[PDB]
């Protein structure tokens, strides 16, 4: 059990959280980028009242 644990199990049960984490995290680049372009629209709209 000792032998086994220090190899396949333990860091493997780690790398699972890590892999998960990173992909959850990176997904939220697209969130911000989209949200950016959303912002751009909103301001662009109130900038046609006062200009072009």
């Amino acid at each position: 059990r000792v032998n086994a644990l220090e190899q396949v199990v333990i860091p493997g049960i780690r790398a699972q959280i890590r892999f998960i984490q990173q992909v959850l995290e990176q997904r939220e680049r697209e969130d911000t980028f989209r949200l950016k372009r959303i912002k751009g629209k909103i301001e662009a709209r109130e900038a046609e009242e006062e200009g072009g």
């Binding site: 990173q22 995290e25 990176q26 939220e28 680049r29 911000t32 950016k36």
Partner: peptide, 9 residues
């Protein structure tokens, strides 16, 4: 501001 997250949190 426009220094939004892009690394990892």
């Amino acid at each position: 501001l426009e220094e939004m997250p892009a690394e990892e949190g």
